[PDB]
């Protein structure tokens, strides 16, 4: 039960934390290009600040 609670439950809590952060890690890996795309509407909106 503990391994069921650990490997099949707690590791899925880790998984549901890892999967919820799986794209984070990819996004963290591609932090600048994700900023280049996911926040692409920042620099373009920055051009009209002045």
């Amino acid at each position: 039960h503990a391994f069921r609670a650990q490997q099949k439950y707690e590791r899925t809590t880790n998984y549901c934390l890892d999967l919820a952060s799986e794209q984070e890690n990819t996004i963290s890996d591609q932090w600048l290009p994700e900023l280049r795309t996911a926040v692409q509407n920042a620099q373009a909106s920055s051009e009209h600040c002045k």
Binding site: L32, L35, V39, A42, Q43, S46, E47, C49, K50
Partner: peptide, 15 residues
């Protein structure tokens, strides 16, 4: 020129 160049930094950043 300086306006468009500098403003991209924030984009770059009981039981």
């Amino acid at each position: 020129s300086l306006a468009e160049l500098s403003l991209y930094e924030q984009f770059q950043r009981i039981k």
